[PDB]
Amino acid sequence: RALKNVTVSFRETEENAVWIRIAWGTQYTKPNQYKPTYVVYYSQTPYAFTSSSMLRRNTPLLGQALTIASKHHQIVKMDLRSRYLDSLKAIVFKQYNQTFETHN
Amino acid sequence: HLNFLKKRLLQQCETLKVPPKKMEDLTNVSSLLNMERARDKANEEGLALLQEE
């Protein structure tokens, strides 16, 4: 309803992950398959990872779609960019230290 | 006589003066008109939908 021509592809995988591929376009152009946008969403969590390719033009629209489809109110961008997705996953979920002292 | 009067009309067009104007070749008139009609209809319906929303 916001744009006119846009391609959306979903892939629901375990680890509670949803991969979304988006090909952007408007009322007077066809969807460009050369510059897609990738999103990784974790269900029932306030975090979502995105690939910075072309969303600089449609960032508010993507934020609105994410905050409406997931039944939220606000959305903000964290000052944390990195090429290693697993490192970001471990840092954001703060599960990089898995050593606990116990006598058992 | 046809070619004679045709050359004469060519000369008469050469002697005439007119303020300058610009366009392209004549083979792509109908095609460009159809593309512009289609684009106009598409833009109109899109604007109507956006305005209703």
- 3-state SS of chain B is CHHHHHHHHHHHHHHCCCCCCCCCCCCCHHHHHHHHHHHHHHHHHHHHHHHHC
For residues B14-38, one letter each, b for 16 or more C-beta atoms within 10 angstroms of the residue's C-beta and e for the rest, the string is eeeeeeeeeeeeeeeeeeeeeeeee
Q: Which residue, chain included where needed, has tokens 């703060």?
A: A94
Q: How far apart are CA A66 and CA A73, in angstroms?
A: 10
Question: Resolution limit in angstroms?
Answer: 2.8
What's the gap in Å between the CA of A29 and the closest CA on chain B? 10
Q: How far apart are CA A49 and CA A92, in angstroms?
A: 10
Q: Map residue A91 onto helix, strand or coil.
A: helix
Rg of the Cα atoms in chain B: 21
Cβ pair A37, A24 in contact under 8 A = yes
The method recorded for this entry reads cryo-EM
Q: Which residue, chain included where needed, has tokens 């109110």?
A: A73
Taking CB atoms and an 8 Å cutoff, what residues of chain A touch B42? 27-28
Asked whether the CA dihedral A43, A37, A57, A82 is positive or negative, the reply is positive
What's the gap in Å between the CA of A9 and the closest CA on chain B? 24
Chain breaks in chain A (C to N over 2.5 A) after: none
Cβ pair A67, A73 in contact under 8 A = yes
Taking CB atoms and an 8 Å cutoff, what residues of chain A touch B53? 1
Cβ pair A34, A12 in contact under 8 A = no
Q: How far apart are CA A37 and CA A29, in angstroms?
A: 17
For residues A81-102, one letter each, b for 16 or more C-beta atoms within 10 angstroms of the residue's C-beta and e for the rest, the string is eeeeeeebbeeeeeeeeeeeee
User: Which tokens in the block code for residue A1?
Assistant: 């309803």
Is A57 exposed, middle or buried (CB count within 10 Å of its CB: 0-12, 13-18, 19+)? exposed
